[PDB]
Design a protein around this ligand. Structure first.
Ligand code: CLA
Ligand code: CLA
Ligand code: CLA
Ligand code: CLA
Ligand SMILES: CC1=C(/C=C/C(C)=C/C=C/C(C)=C/C=C/C=C(C)/C=C/C=C(C)/C=C/C2=C(C)CCCC2(C)C)C(C)(C)CCC1
Ligand SMILES: CC1=C(/C=C/C(C)=C/C=C/C(C)=C/C=C/C=C(C)/C=C/C=C(C)/C=C/C2=C(C)CCCC2(C)C)C(C)(C)CCC1
Lengths: 56, 122
């Protein structure tokens, strides 16, 4: 069958499933952005923009 | 004249009485007469909390807060002697009343600041 490094080639001639895979990728990335923001808000100390700003 | 049923659940019970704009008169003090405050009412409208200094040791400011304990903040039905002093100054000596309220206010970012808002032994 297909080697492991070729599994996604099933999408080349399947525009609908390619759109699905792209939707899933987009869902993952947007889910990352959301999760990352939440984790940052759960750890961020807003009490000192002078000596403890976000980049520290 | 408003009754309990007129007031209940409106928020008015936590408000102090007001006087209209025409009340700009003068109340004479006879220094031979004894006086009392029969009712002192205090209705807080803003609670400010002094931010803890970052370490810069400049002037830490008093910042706004959000009340979270609802319309439960006013001091009222307070009474006491109003003494006339020899130099003609008046001294209020708080005796009794609903002279405290626990209050919780919340700073930006969530820190909750409980206080005993009070004039006990004023
Ligand atoms: C954007 C991500 C993405 C998307 C949209 C797809 C989509 C697709 N894959 Mg591919 N795949 C991916 C990533 C992805 N894959 C990764 C990272 C691997 C290595 C594990 C694979 C390996 C793979 C194989 C072997 C096969 C596919 C196949 C397919 C198709 C059918 C679905 C399937 O069987 O998935 C299977 C893939 C998975 C179930 C992904 C693994 C899940 C990982 C472990 C993360 C799970 C999240 C987890 C909850 C978080 C863990 C947190 C941790 C800190 C503990 C479809 C085109 C099939 C295909 O059609 O072959 C012709 C197929 O046989 N994929
Ligand atoms: C938009 C970017 C993009 C897209 C959509 C594709 C899509 C494709 N690639 Mg190409 N490729 C890319 C960029 C991309 N590639 C980059 C940047 C490189 C260099 C790193 C390559 C090098 C490359 C090679 C050498 C090959 C492909 C192949 C393929 C095809 C099969 C993929 C597969 O089934 O893997 C299945 C993959 C797995 C089952 C697991 C992979 C696990 C990886 C290595 C580690 C974990 C990755 C992690 C989950 C991703 C994090 C996201 C990242 C951006 C930070 C498919 C058409 C194959 C092909 O042409 O088939 C005919 C093939 O041989 N790609
Ligand atoms: C009306 C014309 C039109 C419009 C507005 C779009 C718009 C888009 N296309 Mg293209 N496309 C078109 C014509 C169009 N296309 C035609 C005629 C073809 C040949 C069939 C294609 C083939 C094509 C492929 C193969 C792919 C796209 C993809 C995309 C999306 C990429 C960006 C993205 O996902 O953002 C992020 C998304 C958002 C911020 C949300 C947007 C909200 C959507 C539009 C509302 C959904 C409801 C709507 C009624 C149903 C779908 C609308 C559809 C016209 C796109 C974007 C929504 C890619 C995709 O879907 O990636 C996931 C993709 O893989 N298109
Ligand atoms: C411009 C931005 C961008 C681009 C071009 C891509 C492109 C890609 N992404 Mg997405 N991704 C992005 C942003 C992006 N990503 C962001 C911001 C997030 C949230 C963190 C993700 C989360 C994400 C997940 C969870 C997955 C992808 C996957 C993919 C691949 C799908 C096509 C494929 O089959 O490749 C085949 C794979 C390759 C060609 C190998 C790519 C190798 C990368 C570039 C470096 C790998 C590093 C190292 C070897 C392994 C990681 C270290 C390990 C300790 C974790 C493709 C390379 C999917 C994929 O890799 O499926 C197999 C996948 O599962 N991405
Ligand atoms: C369904 C639904 C829902 C929900 C959702 C959700 C809840 C979500 C999510 C999500 C999510 C929550 C997500 C996420 C994600 C993530 C990710 C995607 C990640 C990733 C990662 C990575 C990729 C990594 C990597 C790496 C490492 C690990 C280390 C170092 C290096 C690197 C960086 C490479 C709602 C209700 C709205 C509605 C409708 C339905
Ligand atoms: C219709 C319907 C339904 C639905 C559902 C759904 C649609 C679901 C889903 C779902 C989902 C879709 C889910 C998910 C998920 C996810 C995940 C599992 C994730 C994760 C993640 C992570 C792990 C992350 C991490 C991180 C990051 C990335 C960054 C920052 C940091 C941290 C670490 C936090 C039901 C059945 C109920 C029934 C009825 C109806």
């Amino acid at each position: 069958g297909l080697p492991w490094y070729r599994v996604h080639t099933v999408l080349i001639n399947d525009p609908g499933r390619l759109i699905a895979a792209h939707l899933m990728h987009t869902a993952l990335v947007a889910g990352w952005a959301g999760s990352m923001a939440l984790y940052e808000l759960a750890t961020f100390d807003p009490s000192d923009p002078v000596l403890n700003p976000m980049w520290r | 004249t408003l009754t309990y049923d007129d007031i209940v659940g409106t928020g008015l019970a936590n408000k102090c009485p007001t006087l209209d704009d025409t009340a700009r008169g003068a109340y004479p003090i006879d220094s031979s007469q004894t006086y009392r405050i029969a009712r002192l009412c205090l209705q807080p409208t803003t609670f400010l909390v002094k931010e803890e200094p970052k370490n810069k040791r400049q002037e830490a400011e008093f910042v706004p807060t959000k009340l979270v304990t609802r319309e439960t903040t006013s001091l009222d039905q307070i009474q006491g002697e109003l003494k006339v002093n020899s130099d003609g100054s008046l001294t209020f000596v708080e005796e009794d009343g609903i002279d405290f309220q626990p209050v919780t206010v919340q700073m930006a970012g969530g820190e909750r600041i409980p206080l005993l808002f009070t004039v006990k032994n004023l």
